[PDB]
């Protein structure tokens, strides 16, 4: 894969907007939406909230896990534990990039949410290169990754698997 398709899979998460136009139910091949009552919340998939925000037709809302207090506890829980701890949403990096870039003025304290998210990320990446070094160092044959999201996997996967194949080969070249 590549980041630009993880970003595609991440635009299926649901968010809540507040439209300012009138429209009746829409029957999408992936569900139903609406109705859109001006000045009333409604829950849509991201790829539509962003596209409506760019055309000046809505007003986003911060997801509940995107609070500057619960995050300041996740950031500590992550540094205490010694394994991959569970995360608010399986796609938090892409959410807190797309949202904070496109709707940073409808989110209060954007430039602290952003730094806490980055602090969590910079740790969950450090635990990986330790869990991906003991693997080689001790020549394991299995490794249980607990709560890795698809993005951390995809940033260093096409190197790790490709450097473990060359190790299986070198380790089983004497049998015949």
């Amino acid at each position: 894969m590549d980041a630009a398709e993880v970003e595609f899979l991440a635009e299926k998460e649901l968010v809540t907007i507040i439209p300012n136009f009138s429209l009746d139910k829409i029957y999408l091949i992936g569900g139903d939406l609406g109705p859109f009552n001006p000045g009333l919340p409604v829950e849509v998939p991201l790829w539509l909230a962003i596209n409506l925000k760019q055309r000046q037709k809505c007003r986003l809302l911060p997801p509940e896990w995107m609070d500057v207090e619960k995050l300041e506890k996740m950031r500590d829980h992550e540094r205490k534990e010694e394994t991959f701890t569970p995360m608010p949403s399986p796609y938090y990096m892409e959410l807190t990039k797309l949202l904070l870039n496109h709707a940073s003025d409808n989110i209060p304290k954007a430039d602290e949410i952003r730094t806490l998210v980055k602090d969590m990320w910079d740790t969950r990446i450090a635990k990986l290169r330790v869990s991906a070094d003991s693997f080689v160092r001790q020549q394991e044959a299995h490794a249980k990754l607990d709560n890795l999201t698809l993005m951390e996997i995809n940033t260093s996967g096409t190197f790790l698997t490709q450097a473990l194949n060359h190790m299986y080969k070198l380790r089983t070249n004497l049998q015949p």
């Binding site: 693997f135 394991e140 044959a141 790790l160 698997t161 194949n165």
Partner: protein
Amino acid sequence: LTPAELIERLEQAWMNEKFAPELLESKPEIVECVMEQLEHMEENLRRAKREDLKVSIHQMEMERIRYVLSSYLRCRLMKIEKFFPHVLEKEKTRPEGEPSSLSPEELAFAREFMANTESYLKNVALKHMPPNLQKVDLFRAVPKPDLDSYVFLRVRERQENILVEPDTDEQRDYVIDLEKGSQHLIRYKTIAPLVASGAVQLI
């Protein structure tokens, strides 16, 4: 099979083909039953086109689905053109009652591809050779798929008693179990029949 679930299963059929090291199962049902929603909702837009916002909300979703599907197909016409002889053989000797790994149309494409390349190599360098080398067999020139690759997977049907062979020493094999929703990093050979049975999905 609500039209809402075809897409949820299509994305899953889309990731596996991207990560697997071998040409996986053939799903003719879905590829032929999503080309129906596309073929239908392309008509209820060109007819009732006299709205200017609804048609946009529909065209965007159609364009997302027509990319999932398309990039899924392209990802298999790469497996076929890299493994054409080994994928023809496997389909010729298939025991009846086993899901094919080739559509009836990919099969024609693969037949024509093998024919074309053989008829090309026959007239450039395999013709002007001494008259005992002019035949080269394409089961020992095209490398077979490599099913000793490592993959990340996340499981969604609790499995137990899974064999983990680190090396050639049959003794060193410790059996493991799998929870639900967990994620592991294991070789593709030991979990081959699980991807075909929906028990896992290569993330």
